[PDB]
């Protein structure tokens, strides 16, 4: 149960990295 | 032309005057033997 919890949180962070890079708000010059 | 005794003058000497006294003390210490 503890191992599942640690790996789950880690996996969410890796997923977050993916969205934060490839699905970021695009920088736009105004 | 310029004033000579200022707040700056006081601040400079509150630090510089003991610093020289202390350096003379610590220089003397280098010659103390047990």
């Amino acid at each position: 149960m503890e191992t599942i919890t640690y790996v789950f949180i880690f996996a969410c962070i890796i997923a977050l990295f993916f969205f934060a890079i490839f699905f970021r708000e695009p920088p736009r010059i105004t | 032309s310029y004033p000579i005794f200022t707040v700056r003058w006081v601040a400079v000497h509150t630090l510089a005057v003991p610093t020289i006294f202390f350096l003379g003390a610590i220089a003397a210490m280098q010659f103390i033997q047990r």
Binding site: - | P3, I4, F5
Partner: protein, 34 residues
């Protein structure tokens, strides 16, 4: 202690050798501010 007068006599003569060489601007600049 006699050493107190031995230690401070240098500082005593230094403060006297610097007032007598700046006194024409110590009481002077004091009299200009008033």
């Amino acid at each position: 202690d006699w050493r107190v007068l031995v230690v401070l006599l240098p500082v005593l003569l230094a403060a006297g050798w610097a007032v007598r060489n700046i006194l024409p601007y110590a009481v002077k600049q004091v009299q200009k501010l008033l």
